[PDB]
Amino acid sequence: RDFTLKPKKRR
Amino acid sequence: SGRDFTLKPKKRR
Amino acid sequence: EDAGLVAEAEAVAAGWMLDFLCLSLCRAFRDGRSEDFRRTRNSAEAIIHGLSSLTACQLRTIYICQFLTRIAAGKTLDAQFENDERITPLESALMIWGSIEKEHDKLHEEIQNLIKIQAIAVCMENGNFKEAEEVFERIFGDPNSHMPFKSKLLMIISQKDTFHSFFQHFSYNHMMEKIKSYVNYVLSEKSSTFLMKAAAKVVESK
Amino acid sequence: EDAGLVAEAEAVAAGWMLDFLCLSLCRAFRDGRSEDFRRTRNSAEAIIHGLSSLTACQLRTIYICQFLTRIAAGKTLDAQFENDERITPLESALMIWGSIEKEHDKLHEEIQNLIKIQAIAVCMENGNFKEAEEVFERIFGDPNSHMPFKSKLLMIISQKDTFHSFFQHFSYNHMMEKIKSYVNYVLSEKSSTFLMKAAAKVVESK
């Protein structure tokens, strides 16, 4: 849905 | 194994 | 040991999920539900990547999922499904069609020839007359010359006829509905698989 | 009709797969199997993304899966888990920990306070002292912060002492053991779910 488990590589 | 099979392609072939 | 019995149980449930995600992918492909096809494809690819070892039956299921993805992106020429950058999606779907363990009957031969014809027609309706000539040789060229219209396609490429009537008779849609005719066969062949079966029983009583 | 009952059947199977992949994620997290955790995470991502609606029971399951993915990447500061670019991995799990509809018991407070400490300690195991001060202000200026160590933490930042013995007592290891204790509690709550109990019976007699 609008839920995320994987991150992106620049915070 | 299972990691060798892809269902999604890449952009700009 | 309790840890070993868990790993085998997860590998069993992973096989149940792969079969179900194949039904959902086949049904979304037939029904033309594009967004449900995109989500089911992502779920199938993640479960496949999670499998440590494959059986012959599971490899057949993975190739069915792969075949539907290249066919769905048959007209998307800038999509790269293989490491070789020169393999068009319809060319990739042709290689998988010859790898699925299945009957090589009349329907299989009709779908294969329609893929070969449309692999060139897709390049024709984009101005890529050079790539259409390259696709023609990787498929036909002079391997063993096992096709009648092999010479008729060559001239159409030289015609640079972007929209030829021959491509409309052996159309992209005629290839689609014959694949969906086979998809309906796979939909019936696997309809008794565990996960979709128990899910159907739950809905029947409700 | 058939299309409506199919959509309901695919929703029941999707809920079964979420509970199973949640149990597999907690088990790989507890055991420390990083590669299996990475693959089970990707499978849980797409299964959750394919769910249209969510029940209150499934919402808690997603939060639990979210909580483990960010604790597993707690020391990776540049890993952005939220659309909000300022949320570090540990303070993202801190928001999820308060979002899970669960018992706010003794173990809940210990995990919460240890996350708040390590959210700053992780920023100071590197040379990111500016990020540590900005994490402290986001978690603790006023007044939702009844932690007595608010004064000691604010002082440790301006010490530049990375190997501070305060962080060796409230360490990342102590935070992991408290979370793995809760993971074991979750691991036994849904160890009797449909998909896992079905696959277990297939292997148990095998």
Side-chain angles (χ1 to χ4, degrees), chain C residues 128-140:
Chain C
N128 307 336
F129 312 117
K130 279 176 176 173
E131 189 172 23
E133 200 172 24
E134 304 165 1
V135 172
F136 178 83
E137 300 297 326
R138 294 186 285 259
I139 298 178
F140 301 100

Side-chain angles (χ1 to χ4, degrees), chain D residues 163-176:
Chain D
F163 295 86
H164 202 302
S165 57
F166 177 85
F167 291 152
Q168 299 192 20
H169 187 254
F170 306 102
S171 61
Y172 205 91
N173 307 282
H174 202 203
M175 187 195 68
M176 288 292 297

Side-chain angles (χ1 to χ4, degrees), chain B, chain C residues 42 45 48-49 52 66 70 77-80 85 131:
Chain B
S1 53
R3 78 189 75 166
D4 306 329
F5 299 85
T6 77
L7 304 195
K8 303 199 266 70
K10 291 171 179 174
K11 297 183 179 181
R12 282 196 169 184
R13 179 185 58 85
Chain C
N42 300 336
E45 196 191 55
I48 291 170
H49 287 169
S52 57
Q66 287 199 335
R70 284 103 174 107
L77 276 184
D78 70 311
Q80 184 177 339
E85 201 183 10
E131 189 172 23

Side-chain angles (χ1 to χ4, degrees), chain D residues 54-156:
Chain D
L54 295 173
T55 64
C57 183
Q58 297 176 335
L59 172 67
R60 175 198 165 188
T61 299
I62 301 173
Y63 280 146
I64 295 176
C65 297
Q66 289 189 319
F67 180 73
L68 302 188
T69 55
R70 288 149 182 81
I71 297 298
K75 287 169 175 283
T76 309
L77 263 169
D78 72 323
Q80 186 187 348
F81 282 89
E82 308 287 344
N83 284 325
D84 193 326
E85 203 179 25
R86 306 175 65 178
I87 316 297
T88 71
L90 274 176
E91 61 190 316
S92 180
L94 186 65
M95 298 175 176
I96 301 167
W97 193 244
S99 300
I100 303 176
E101 214 153 47
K102 58 182 301 302
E103 288 243 351
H104 277 40
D105 59 334
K106 166 201 171 189
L107 179 63
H108 184 92
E109 312 291 311
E110 297 177 341
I111 297 179
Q112 171 189 146
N113 295 334
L114 282 170
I115 288 178
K116 295 183 177 183
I117 296 178
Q118 286 298 312
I120 303 176
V122 157
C123 297
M124 301 193 60
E125 293 182 5
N126 307 95
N128 306 26
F129 305 102
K130 275 85 173 186
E131 181 71 66
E133 259 159 346
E134 303 165 41
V135 166
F136 178 89
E137 199 71 21
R138 212 144 40 205
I139 299 179
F140 306 84
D142 272 293
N144 228 32
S145 261
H146 184 230
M147 182 181 303
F149 313 108
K150 186 211 222 71
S151 303
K152 200 169 187 178
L153 285 177
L154 184 57
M155 177 183 58
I156 290 173

Side-chain angles (χ1 to χ4, degrees), chain D residues 27-39:
Chain D
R27 194 167 290 149
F29 180 87
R30 173 197 67 175
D31 302 352
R33 296 176 276 103
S34 65
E35 281 298 303
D36 298 355
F37 185 91
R38 188 188 75 94
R39 291 178 167 88

